[PDB]
Structure formats: structure tokens, C-alpha cells
Design a protein around this ligand. Sequence first.
Ligand SMILES: *[C@@H]1O[C@H](CO)[C@@H](O[C@@H]2O[C@H](CO)[C@@H](O)[C@H](O)[C@H]2NC(C)=O)[C@H](O)[C@H]1NC(C)=O
Ligand SMILES: *[C@@H]1O[C@H](CO)[C@@H](O[C@@H]2O[C@H](CO)[C@@H](O)[C@H](O)[C@H]2NC(C)=O)[C@H](O)[C@H]1NC(C)=O
Ligand SMILES: CCCCCCCCO[C@@H]1O[C@H](CO)[C@@H](O)[C@H](O)[C@H]1O
Ligand SMILES: CCCCCCCCO[C@@H]1O[C@H](CO)[C@@H](O)[C@H](O)[C@H]1O
Lengths: 311, 311, 222, 222, 211, 211, 213, 213
Amino acid sequence: VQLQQPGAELVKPGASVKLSCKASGYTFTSYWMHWVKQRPGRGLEWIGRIDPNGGGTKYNEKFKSKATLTVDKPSSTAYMQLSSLTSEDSAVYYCARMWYYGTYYFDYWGQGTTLTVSSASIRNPQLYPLKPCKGTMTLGCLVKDYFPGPVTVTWYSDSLNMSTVNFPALGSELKVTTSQVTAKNFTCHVTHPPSFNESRTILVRPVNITEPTLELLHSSCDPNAFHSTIQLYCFIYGHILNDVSVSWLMDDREITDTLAQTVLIKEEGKLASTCSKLNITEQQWMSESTFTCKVTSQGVDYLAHTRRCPD
Amino acid sequence: VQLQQPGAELVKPGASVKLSCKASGYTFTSYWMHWVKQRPGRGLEWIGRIDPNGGGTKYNEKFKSKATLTVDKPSSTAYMQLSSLTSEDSAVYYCARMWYYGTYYFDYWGQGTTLTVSSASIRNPQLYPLKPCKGTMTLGCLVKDYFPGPVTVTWYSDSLNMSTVNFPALGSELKVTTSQVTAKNFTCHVTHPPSFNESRTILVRPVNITEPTLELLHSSCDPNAFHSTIQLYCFIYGHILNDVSVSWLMDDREITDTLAQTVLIKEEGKLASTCSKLNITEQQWMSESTFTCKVTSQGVDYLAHTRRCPD
Amino acid sequence: DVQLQESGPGFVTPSQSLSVTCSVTGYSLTASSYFWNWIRKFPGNKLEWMGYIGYDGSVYYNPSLKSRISITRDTSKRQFFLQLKTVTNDDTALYYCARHGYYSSRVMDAWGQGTSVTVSSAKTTAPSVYPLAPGSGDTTNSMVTLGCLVKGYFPEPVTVTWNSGSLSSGVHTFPAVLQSGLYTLSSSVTVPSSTWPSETVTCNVAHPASSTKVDKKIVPRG
Amino acid sequence: DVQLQESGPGFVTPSQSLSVTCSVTGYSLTASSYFWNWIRKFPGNKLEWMGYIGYDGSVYYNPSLKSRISITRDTSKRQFFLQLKTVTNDDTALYYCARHGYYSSRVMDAWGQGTSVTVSSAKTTAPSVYPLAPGSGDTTNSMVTLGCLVKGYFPEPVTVTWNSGSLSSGVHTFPAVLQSGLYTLSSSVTVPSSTWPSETVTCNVAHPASSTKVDKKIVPRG
Amino acid sequence: QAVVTQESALTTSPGETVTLTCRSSTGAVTTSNYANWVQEKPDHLFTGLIGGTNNRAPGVPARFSGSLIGDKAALTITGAQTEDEAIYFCALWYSNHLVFGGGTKLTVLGQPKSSPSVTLFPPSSEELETNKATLVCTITDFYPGVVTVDWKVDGTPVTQGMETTQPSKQSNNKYMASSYLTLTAGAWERHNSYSCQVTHEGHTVEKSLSR
Amino acid sequence: QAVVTQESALTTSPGETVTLTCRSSTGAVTTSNYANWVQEKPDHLFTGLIGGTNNRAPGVPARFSGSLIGDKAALTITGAQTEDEAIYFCALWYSNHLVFGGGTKLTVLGQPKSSPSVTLFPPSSEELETNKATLVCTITDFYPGVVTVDWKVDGTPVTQGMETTQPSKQSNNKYMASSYLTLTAGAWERHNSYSCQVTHEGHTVEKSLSR
Amino acid sequence: DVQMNQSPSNLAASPGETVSINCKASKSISRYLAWYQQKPGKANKLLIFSGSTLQSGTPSRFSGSGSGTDFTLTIRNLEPEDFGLYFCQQHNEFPLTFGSGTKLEIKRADAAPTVSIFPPSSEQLTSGGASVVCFLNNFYPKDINVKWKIDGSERQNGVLNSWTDQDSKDSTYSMSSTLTLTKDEYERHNSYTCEATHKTSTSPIVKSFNRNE
Amino acid sequence: DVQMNQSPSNLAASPGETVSINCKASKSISRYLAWYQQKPGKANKLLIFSGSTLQSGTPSRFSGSGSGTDFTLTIRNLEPEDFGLYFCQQHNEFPLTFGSGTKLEIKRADAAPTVSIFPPSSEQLTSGGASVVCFLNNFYPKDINVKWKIDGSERQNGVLNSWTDQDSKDSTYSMSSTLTLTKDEYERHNSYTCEATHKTSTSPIVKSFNRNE
Ligand SMILES: *[C@@H]1O[C@H](CO)[C@@H](O[C@@H]2O[C@H](CO)[C@@H](O)[C@H](O)[C@H]2NC(C)=O)[C@H](O)[C@H]1NC(C)=O
Ligand SMILES: *[C@@H]1O[C@H](CO)[C@@H](O[C@@H]2O[C@H](CO)[C@@H](O)[C@H](O)[C@H]2NC(C)=O)[C@H](O)[C@H]1NC(C)=O
Ligand SMILES: CCCCCCCCO[C@@H]1O[C@H](CO)[C@@H](O)[C@H](O)[C@H]1O
Ligand SMILES: CCCCCCCCO[C@@H]1O[C@H](CO)[C@@H](O)[C@H](O)[C@H]1O
């Protein structure tokens, strides 16, 4: 169920406006359509009720000389036209469903249309994209100078888990919208009546880094052999297919005399897994010196450290 | 170059035999063909010389009444026919090449044909396959009872590096041939003149076992962490695709409380490689107890033992 | 490159829970073999290693702080958090987050700036600003040191300027002294003793914890 | 299952090279984690572990035998070989090959029967066979023990039967005694003293090292 | 005319029960008034709760009940949830029209204090092409809904172009706001360090940028 | 008639030089005799070495040379190899025929002693279907070429059906032989253990089987 | 825990000179001792670890030596960037423990403090309290003493002192001293004096005021 | 090397009885000591390792205990298959070393030896030597003594003894004794005697011959 109303309308004093309320997701001719007025900082005022099944219109005595109710079955749309408009009429007008058969109750309301009645000049919005400034994805749009009052904002994205926040306006008529993202591109779309002053602005800052997993294993003494060859195995799983660089260190000083054997284990599309083998002596392992395989990929230094278990 | 002569011939006393010597790999009409007689335990006797280019035959005075030389250019074959045959003529007759132009010298000889002149009865060979009897591949054939004297043997195989040995005969007329093999099937073929008493006998005992490689690795203490999880990795490379069973032991007693994680690493046609992971406590590893992964495949027990490096 | 930034409450009441966040930039909290520590310095320059959480999720704490501290992490936000339960005045300290694990032997290879945490049973207080003017007459065309006493406020910090920053040079702002549960600070500016009688010399004191902004003009005494 | 079989020369001259082969059945010499050892027993029942070659090709020797021994292998034949250089009389022993590595702590899980090696500066000698008959008359229908003395032969073994195996029961063949460089052995058979005077009692002595086969009929003395 | 009166604001703790009343100037509310109860939440979201005098609308939890108590209509919430904090409007039918009340602001206690999330955006290149600049400091998810904002570039800004909005309640019953520092493009090129401080319950959350 | 005479046997060490002579009963060998030298190796393999009096055949190593020394023809091997151990025949041409000598058996020393490889084959099922049986004991690769064979089933076989061949030289200048134990099928079913012993230079190599 | 004892707590030097800091360990830490450096307004930075191993970015003029329980960091040819805070950390065992630290300040010519005394304001005396202030600006060395005198009587109660860091421009120090009295006590007396004893003057620099208008 | 001392060297028992063998170590071998068994005509077979761990096929009647430098193998409810040779091996360190071994023979009823003396043959006296032989067949226990007497004079030179293994059918022993003389020495005397002292007779069993035909 959805009752679609325009975001905002603008007229000049003495003119007439035709507000609409489009139905969706329910039987159009089975519910009453009420119209309710709300001025900022005030309560609710009932205007009129219209029966979409027939022509049953009923008005409050206060609004009889100003309001006219209409129903469009082919378009499934309710209408309220206001005439003799003054600044006293600038308000949000909601349409609401009411159930008639059996019990009497309300349920679904519209979002309301903000009607402004003014002869003042119009200032169209200025859209500036808000640069996140590295240190965090948080995008946003600043709607600087605009005027008769109302401004609406929507967002486009290439999917993703995205949240949006629309902030209240300043007394100097400035507005801000923001978007938090949980790798795509983004843009914001702003509408500013009169008419459709639809502006749009785009922004994006992408990323792309793959983090591999390191397993530093060790070949220990076979208890059946007098001498065992101690060898360290640096397994790098899931790195970028063509970007990996392995070096070895002992006590945090790079090993250059002994050569390591670095071979490819597996390829999975654009990813790969490799193993680097390095031999050390039994004395070096027994000395409780540390050993490190430093893997460099995409400018990132992953490391793995090992040492015989002391005590 | 090859001078092909029959293995052996048999005639009755007073009859005539036609021995042949087929040429191969050289100009047939450019070499002299000599015939030389050798009786067992004696030296060589020259019989005749024939010129394949013309009809130049020359005989030793001793063999003029018995030997006749013939040359067949279309068949590239020399012939010597012996008449008035007695037991004095039972011998090996070789054909030999001699170079005429420039210098006079011998080079290539035939294998010789063993001519036996006898009226005795004929006993055809009995082929029995020699069972290697497990404990070693060594196949063979026993040619039990046979007679006028000569017996020849050849072998068939489905390729492979194969060696063969043909043994001398007993005074009771028994023979043996053997074959050493470096997984196929084998058979032996025996010829026993008169005519072609070609018999054959087959034998085979196949095998099929794949030996995997074991690597028992160990995750040691990270010197940057206060507590490290000690884990043993039993890598089994190149086992049979659907036959591998891994169990774990500590101090040669099977581990049943702790569960191991055994997963597949890679598949290569009918082979595969897996890894079994087992967690142990730091105390268990420091206690210098032994740890074993016992891998069973195709009824064979491969094992890997590990232990912290002592002292 | 890696950047660590601390974020705390500034002040906390005793018996309450202390929570400090460390935001990490450049590296992942799950990158292989890195360990993220909380350490703290007490007023007497004593450093105390509190604990760490590892790249693998493992944690280890100083035994003197066990049962009180808890280190957690959010890897999507790339933040890790220290929680200290039932704080006392002996928990007042400058809290750093650090990273070790680049080198092999338990050495901090990255440090944050640190965030100050005062554990005090005191509430937010706006300061009283008093003028500091000489108690005697000035010789003509001499130099005069005027000042402002910003007394009885909590918590830190407080910002003191002179003539809205016009008097930049000749300014001395002293570190606040904590007496009872309140801070006392003194600021001074040196100007020509001919500028003071003909122009305005005012200190602007801003205490954002109470949203206080006051101006104090230094008027000669009589 | 695994079977180990030794194969040696039987006897070797001092200062020469000793070579012993171990044939293996059932298992590969390269199967993971198995070790193949040479061990030997001296006449006084003392066992000495000599050394091993590993599944990986590595070797390790008893330090008392280092620079003298060498252990090699042929993996296609599934054999492994011990070579001992410059043998002396103190190298006379029963040589076994063994397999350890099934269990974790250096314990022989398979043994061969063993092959005897006599290091002696002596050559092949056929034996002299003398009869052993009583030096007195026999009571009628008594039992008589006759025998054969197989003296002065080298090397072992020698095979002694009685009437080509017809006299199976009542036979005692004693272990040979090595004096000088020669072996002496005695065999005996017990028969009715009524069988001896009417039938033939002959010992058959076979020494294959000299291809000797002799028959000695036990004739009564006078 | 006929007017409808409700309480200005009520306060309940989670798990408790609360009653909101609706009085008519005509004297006594009856079943002929069809006492309707509607719920308003942030972003102008109205939801009909109860019709008749007790006829619950489909999709409304059972903890909302309606009745007539004394001469007034009454909406009782039995076992209040934190999601029930909202503005509740009464509506009575008189012959040919419907009259709403002023609404009752129902606050639900027990909600924990929440520190604000702050994001500082520098001016875009397009705005710097003009002769001005606007640094944007957005603030979300703070409770209670009172907050102050200061700026710091030259040590202690006094006036500059510091402007803030009033706190507005979010759908999660937390609050949001935004602050702005308007300066000139020349002043932007002149200074380097910029910082927004957001003070809430005596604690300051600060963001900063440069370049 | 005219006969040709050579030495019966000569012996040389590897690396040394050796001369084999060829004398004619007619008096003196000349270039008109075309003194040919041929080489015989095991398995009846004859290879022509030298023609004329010194005309080396293609494919013959240069260490083989021919000459006329005194009244005889002569083949000189300069730097003898172990592969040269063979039977060397001389051949002289007389008018209308060619006369061979008796041949010289050239032995090359320095060859190490080699123990025999022994293989014991049990009787096949097809032979056991008859009323007899033949155990086969093959022997190869032993040097020197003298060997004795014994059998063991019932302790000490005396006669039975023990038969052996004479040692025959292999192409590698080692020797081969075979032994046979013929028994009855009933005797085969009666006994279980069977063994062949092969004694060479006083050392015994033994093989055995059962079932 | 391993207790690290660092010495000395304060060093003064000029650029180009050589200094040394020492750390003792309550128990043997093998070679695992690290030296860290902190510049004013900067995060802590690791210089040396494992006793003598330098980071790639640590200048060669820094070196470390020692073992067991005695370790020393030596800094040769001091550059202006080297003045700051230094501290040692044993990294042989958990928990990781640290030393007290050493402040290396830069030397400069001796400077006499500008002394200035301020009486309490009327705004403060309205509430019932009084604060007498004494400033000593731009002096070196840091060693300085302050004596409060009321009618010639020394006063030690109610005094708070606050020293500044070494100035990043002229290498001087500044000190504030506040004496707190009640209004009733402040109005009992006439002459208020602060005396500043510093290396630059044999007699103390005396600043006073009379409570009488 | 580790020296293993095994005791006792000989045990005699009947089926159903319990026996124990001990091995001392010159140095501590922890728990790593193994017991092996050898039956007559069979290869060595590992019974126990690591002091007390049995192979899967080792019967439960075999057990092992001990540590450090003292280890004991106990065999309860002896079966006829358990009689043979036993030896210990330390497997704590290389080189692997072994003990002397223990022979466990089966008991049987005491049996007197059949004694038989043989003079030298004419074939041997042709060459110039002489060998006098004395047999002692089918006796138990193995303890037995032989004295050679020539004309009543004891002879100890030129004597060789040879004992058989315990018979696999009747559990008895047999012994041969050969006295070697020269022909010249043999023909100097008349009476040749061997005396056999055994448990089954108070007086020694005496067998003699006269050199006179
Ligand atoms: C580490 O050392 C081992 C030896 O302990 C190396 O493995 C040997 O490699 C050679 C070839 O270079 C082979 O001939 C040997 O058979 C190998 N030994 C075994 C037991 O198989 C290994 O290559 C070395 N690896 C590195 C990275 O240094
Ligand atoms: C061995 O122990 C490790 C823990 O030290 C296990 O890894 C953990 O597995 C659980 C799931 O069971 C995960 O939630 C943890 O995140 C893992 N730990 C880490 C550090 O990643 C591992 O599964 C165990 N393996 C075996 C075979 O026991
Ligand atoms: C590209 C590889 C990224 C790996 C991110 C792994 C983040 C979580 O990893 C693991 O998940 C477990 C969930 O049960 C947690 O319990 C563990 O603490 C954590 O280590
Ligand atoms: C199916 C797997 C069979 C593996 C058989 C490997 C046999 C040889 O393996 C290795 O070959 C090297 C050659 O240089 C030798 O030096 C090494 O000693 C040996 O271990």
C-alpha cells in the first residue's frame, strides 16, 4: 500500500492549486479518502472526505469556499483543488485512507504535499559534491542557495548496502544530504519546485586490494633420525595472481646467503597461492633465534614470524 | 647390414640340402660371398666363394663333389646346396662378405646354419612356462624333450626394458630360456626343425601400487604472541584418488579424543593430495612427546613422526 | 604506512566504565601477524602495557589488569576498543594504542598520539575569569605584562586568546593545575604600557565543555 | 608385511672388504619415514648397532665404526648394502639387517634372520672323515653308538647323514668347534648292536665349499 | 465550535502501562464520536491505530487498546516499547466534520545516552571556483537531542559564518543536525587546518581536515 | 696339403700390447697370401678385422695392426681392452682356395671375480599334470667360469635327477649355466621345501622355494 | 614483572655534543631492550630494538649497546631534532615493561626571569576568595625558586606552581605561581611580595605590592 | 654410549610359572627401553618398547616396568612358545645399544647321560695324529663335567667341548669332547678313560678302553 503525493507545490496569492494522491496496492473504491491540513508548529485540521465509489464529498464548513474534492477511477487518484489561496493556506496537506464497512478506523496515510503560497522570487539550488576527504565510504551533497522553501533529495547507487541521511535546513536556506556505504559509483538527484528543477551531481573514490593469508610452518626433528633437516614453509594463500614478493629474515636481519625456493601451488582465476621454502641448520633453530617470511603484495607488507618454543 | 641364414636344417643321409643367406643393407653385387664350414670343437674350413655380379664360383677341391653355389639377384640371396650328405657334413655353415676392389678383407659374417644329417626319429619340444615364484620380474620357458639337436627361442613383450638369456642344453636334450624385466604381459616362441614346430607359451603377474609422499609440518610459537596454538599438518601428496585413511598417535598410542580435520588439497586425474590437521596443546609439544600421522593406502602403512627438537 | 588515532571520553566518573577507541588507517586489523595493543602512561611518566588483540582475534592482557579489561574489535570499521570496568582515580592516564608485529620480538612499530582520561568524581564547570593588572603605577612608555586567571573549571581544555588573536606575540599560557576537582590556569600578554591606556586589552576565554565564551577587559586599578 | 633377508660371503680374509646385502620384500626402500639398519652380534652374544640408511637417502653410522663402514641402496632392486673396509678377526660376527620407523622412538620393528661372517686368514679345506667305533666287544642285542669325526675343514657348513637318511632317529650332530683355522665336528647314530654286524652303517659327509662328498662305513675293530 | 483536548506530554518507562485521554468541550465522549487514535513519528509518518472507541486497526499490536473512561476517550498502551515514543492524536466526529486534538507527546525512558557521529566535508572544487567556501559538519545519532558546535581554524573563531540547525529526531529516536562554516575562497587558500568540535553532555567529538 | 698354424692361447693385461702370429707350412708368408685376421666372440659372432697383410677393415679400431714378421703374418693389438678377449683366426690364400688356422684364444686379465646370479623356477602346473616334474636353477654372470651345483630337498640328495650344463661364456666375458632336478609328480606333492645351492670359488649362493 | 630503571631523568646539551642514557633491568632480559623517542607534539617512535638493531630510518648517530641487565643508548653529533623524550622497553617477556624516561633539553645562554606580581581582583574578592599571582617569564636554566612573603612572613600553604615546556623558539622557560587566600585573610595584611631566586642574580628578584589603594 | 647390563644370563622354568629379567642402564634412559624375543630358528621379534608399551601382537602375559636406570620384563603363565632368548635395547639415544641376553630353557625330569668313549682310528693314526672321543647323550640338567684320564693321570691340554642346544623334542642336552694327541704320544699309554660327573649320580660315570687289541 502506498499513497503517492507530490513533494511540494508553489503558487502565487489568489491562485488555485490541484493536489493529488495516487493510490497503489489496495481496492481504490473500497476506502474513504480524507484530506487533512497541518501548518508548521500547529496541530491537524480536517478539510474534506471523498468517497471514490460514488461522488460522496463532505467538507468542513471552514474550507467549503476554498476546497474541492475530485476522484479519478481510471487513474486511481484522489484530488483536492484549493482556490482563493493566501499565506494562511501554506501548509502540508495529507491524504488518508479510512475503512467504512463494519468498524470505522484509519490506517494508511500519505507523506503529504507542502503547499507554499507566495509572490516572492525563486532561487534554484546549487549542488556541490561533498568530498569525503581520506581518513575513513561517506559521500554527500550540499544544496547551498535555494528558495521558496522546499527541497527534495534522492540517491542513485550501483546497489550495495547503503544508508542515507537527509538533514534539516538552515534559516538561511541551506541543506545537506549524506550517504554511508557498506566498490561502485554514486550520485545525488535534487528537485526544487516550482516545476522540476532537477539537478544531479556524481562522485566516486574506488579501492582494490586483496589480502592473502600467511601460514608459516616448520619441519621438526623426526625422533627416529639422528639428524633432521630443519625447513621453514611460508604458505601464501589467495594473493594477487601476478604480485607477490617473498623475502626471509633471521633475527630481523635479511638473509642473503641462503637461497629460498618459491614456487606456485595453485591458480584460481585472478588469485594464486604460493609456497616459499627455506632451509636452516639445527643449531640456528635450537638457538631460539627468530625467523620471518616477509611477503610484499600491492605495496602491503604482510609478515610471518616463528621461533622454537622456548622453556 | 645383416646376413640372414636359417637357424638349423635337417636331412637324411644321402639327401641334399639348400642353405640360403639373405642380404640386407648393402650393395648385393659389390661383395664376394664365401661359405665356411665349422664342425663342433673344430676349426674353420673354407668351402666356396661366389661372385654375385656374375657367375664366378670357385670351390675347394675337397668340396667340389658335394657343394654347389647359386646367386639370386632378384631375391638378393646367396645359396649353397650340399649333396651326398653324410654325418661328416653335420656342421655350422656360415656365409661371409668379402671386399674385392682395392684391398682384400673380410667384414660381415652371418650367424650360420646348423645342418644335421641323420636318419633318427624326431622329438618335438615340450614348452613349460617357468613360474617366477614370488620373492623377487623373472620369467622363463623350459623346453623339456626335443630331438634332432637344434632348438631356437625368441620372446615377445609389450615393450619395456627387457633382457633375455638363452642357456646351453643338457646332454639329455633339455633347454631353458629366461627373461628379466625392468607392467605388461610376456610370452615365448620356440622353433624346432624339421619344418617349423613353432610352439608358444604365455605368462604374466601384474602389479599396481602408488606410493604417496608424506610431509609432517608443525606450527610453532609466534615470538610476538604470548600463547600460540600448536598444530600439526600431515600433507599426503600423490595418493590414490579414492584410497587414503589418516589416523593420529601420540607416544605411539592412538588419539581418539581430539578430532582431526582431513581435507582434499588437489586432484590430478587418478591421483590426489590431502592434508590432515591436528591441534595439540603447548604443554604436549613442550613435553617432548612424539606425534605420528599414520596414513594407510592400498593396504600399505606409510607414517610420519615428529617431536620438538630436544636439548 | 599505518596511522593509529585514539578517541576517548575525556573524563569519567569513578565506578563507571571507561571505553577508548583506536581507529586504524592504512592496514587491516586482520592482516597477517600484526598485534594491536593498549598502553597507558600515568602522570609520573610510568608506562604500563595493558594488553593486545591479535590479527587472528586472540587477546592477551596484563595479569594485573585481568578480570577488569576487555579488548574487542570491529574489522569493517577498522577500529579496536579497550573497555576498563570500575574505574578509580588510579586509572587516570594518557591512553595510547600501538601496533607491534612487524619485527619479530614484541616491539611497538606504530604509536598513536594518545588520549587523556581523567577519572574524577567531578562535573562540568564553567570557569571564573579574573583580570591580572599591576598593583602600582606604570612608568610612561614602559612594557606591561597583563593577564587573565581562569579559575575553577572542569574538564580540560580551555582556550585563551588576546584581542581575538590580534595580540599574538608576547603571550604565555601556562599548563593548568588541578586542585580539588577543578583546574586553574593563568595567561599573560606583554604590551607597551602606552598601548594599554589608549586601546583595549581583552582576553577571550572559551570552555567548550560548558559552551562558555567570555571576554575580560583588563582595566587599570585605582 | 615386510621381509628382510641377508646375503653375505660366508667368510672373508683379513684386510679385505666385507659386503653384505639385505633384500627387502613387501615394502619400498623409499616409503615414508622407514629406516634400514645394519646390526651385528659378536660370538659372546653382544649386539652392536652399526648404522642405517633412511627412506630419504640419509645415512648415519655408529661413531666407533665411522670412516670404515658405508651403507648404500638400490631402490629398484629393493636392496641395501653394508660395506666394511679392512676387516680383522674382531669383525667376525652374525650380521642382521633390520627396519625401524613404524613406531616413533627408534625401535626395530622388523628383523632378518642374519648371515654369518667369519673373518679368518684361512682357505677352503675339505674335511678328513674318521670312523668312531667302540674299543671293546659288544654284548649281543645291545645298543651301540657309532659315529663319524669330520675334522679339519673350512668353512662352515657340513652336512652329515647316516645311510643316506635311512637312519633318521637316534642321531646327534654336535656344533663344530673352531681350532686353529679349521672346524671339527662329531656325529653319532645309535643302532641295535645286532644291526651293525649284518647291515651297513655309513655316514655321508658333504662339504659343498670344496664340492666334497664322502662315505665312511663304520667297520668293527679287532 | 467544538474542540478536542489531550494532554500535552506524557512519559512512560519500557514495560509499564500508560493511558492517554481525549476530552470533548461538548461534555462527554460517546460511541457516536468514533474516537480515533492516530500515531505520528519522525519524517511526517502517520499511522492509524484505533477506530470506533476500541476497534483496533489491522497491523496494530495488541498492547494498544481503546476505551471510554469517565467522560473521555482513552488509549492505553500495556507494556510500552521504546518504539512507541511518538505523538498521539485523537479525533472525534461531530455531525458533518472531524475534529483533531492537539496531540500528546509520549516519551519512552530507559534509552541510553548516545554520542554523536560527526563527519567533516571540505568545500568542493566547484565552490572554490567561486569567491566563497562552505565547510560542512554533519552530526547524527546523538541522545539526548541537545548539542553545541564550535569551529577552529585560526585558534578561536568568534563569528565567521558559523551556522547550525536545530536538533531533529530520527526514526531511531536519536537526533541529527548539521553545522556550516562559510568563508571566502581566499580565506580558504590562506588557512590550512580546519576543525569542527561537537559538544554533547560535556563531551567533545572533534573532526578535522586540511589541504 | 698346405696348413696354417697359430698359437693355441695367449694372455695379455689391459693396456699392454700383444702379438699373434700365423705360420705357413709352405715356408714363408708373403703379401700374395692376403693374410686375413678374423675375430670370433660368443654366440657364433665372427668379425673381419684385417685383410691384405695390414689393410684394416672399416669399423675396426686403430689398435689392431697387421704386419709380416720373419716368415709369419702377425696381428698386433697395441693397448689391449677387455673387450678384445676372443678367438682370433688367420687365413691364407693359396692359388684356388683359402686355408684357416686353428685360432688363438686371447684372454684378457684384470677382470674382477663375479659371483653368480641364481634363479630357481618350480615346475609348472602343466608338467605336474604329468607323472614328473623339473625344478630349474639358472645361473648367470659368474667369473671365473667354473661352478658346482648341489640340490637340497630331503637333506642330502645323492643322485635323484640332478643334471647341469657346462659353463658357457657370455658376451660380457662372464659365464652362464643351468641345473635341473627331475623328480616325480608324487615326489613333488610329497615334499615341500626345495633348494638349489651354487658353489663358486668356495662361496655358495642359494635359492629356495616351497608349496 | 621486569622492572626497568632509567637514568638520568634529565639531560642538557648543545647540538654537536654526545649524550648517553642507561637502563638497568631487575632480571636478565638477554639482548631484548628497545629505545623509543618522542618529539614535542609527535607520537612515540621506535629507534632501536634488540639492544643494538636500528630501524631503517634511525640515523647512524644513534647506537645501542649492552646485555643481560645493563643497556645504554648513545647519541653522537646531536642534531636539533634529537632533543626530546627517550624511554626504554624490555621486550624479552610479557608483560612488556618500560623505563621512567629521560628529557634531553637544548642548552642556551643564561637568562634572568621577568618577574611580575598581581593582586587579587575585585571580581574575585566579591565571592570571598583571593588569588595573588606571580609570573617569571623567559628564564634559563629551569632551576628557579619562589618565596611568598606577607608582611615579611614566609607563606607556604595555598601555593600552586606551573612551569612551561622549553620554548620551541628561544629555549626559555616560564613559571606561574598562585597563592590562594580568603578575603578575610587577605585583608589582614598590607605588603605582598614574591621573591625569585635564580642563577642569574646573587640577590633574589623581588616584586611587591601594597594592599592600600 | 649407554651400557646395558642384563641379568640373569640363564633361566629355567616350567609352563605356567612366572619369570622376570632385569636390565640396568649406565645412565638414565628415561622410559625408552625395549624387550625383544627370539625363538630357536626364528628372527628377532619386538615385544615391548618405551618400557611398558606392548605391540598389538604381544600377549598380555608379557609386561614391562621400570624407568631411569632400572627396567624389568615379567612373563606370567609361561606358555611353551615363550622359551627362548630375550634381550633389551635402550632407545633413548644413538647409538642404540643392547644387553647381553637371557636364555629361558624349559625344565624336565633329571636324566643321566649315555656316555660312550671312542679310540682313534687307523686312518687318523696313518697321518700321525690321534683323536679320542667321548659322548654324553641325552642328559638334563645341562650342568656336567668331563675328566680325561690317561693311565690314571688327568689330562687338560688338547681338549675341546661342544654342547647341543636344548632338544626341541625331549628337552635334553648332548655333549661331545675330543682329546687330541700325537701318534707318538697316544702310543705311550694303555688305559684311556673319560669320567662324566652329573647330578644324576654320586659317582662319576666312567668309560674306558685299552689301547691293546
Ligand atoms: C633443503 O635441504 C634439502 C636437503 O636436506 C634439499 O633437498 C635435497 O635436494 C637435492 C637437490 O638439490 C636432492 O638431490 C636431495 O635428494 C634432496 N634431499 C632429500 C632428502 O630429498 C632441499 O632442496 C633444500 N631446499 C631449500 C629451499 O634449500
Ligand atoms: C585448531 O584450533 C584452532 C584455534 O586455535 C581452530 O581455529 C579456529 O576455528 C574456529 C572454528 O572452529 C574459528 O571460529 C576460529 O576463528 C579459528 N581460530 C583462528 C585463530 O582462526 C582450528 O579449527 C582447529 N583445528 C583442528 C583440526 O582442531
Ligand atoms: C580476505 C580474508 C579476510 C579474513 C577476515 C576474517 C575475519 C574473522 O576471522 C575470524 O572469524 C571468526 C568468526 O567466528 C572469529 O571468531 C575469529 O575471532 C576471527 O579470527
Ligand atoms: C613415487 C615416488 C618415488 C620417489 C623415489 C625417489 C628416489 C630418489 O630420491 C632421491 O633422489 C636423489 C637423486 O639425486 C638422491 O640423491 C636422494 O638420495 C634420493 O632421496
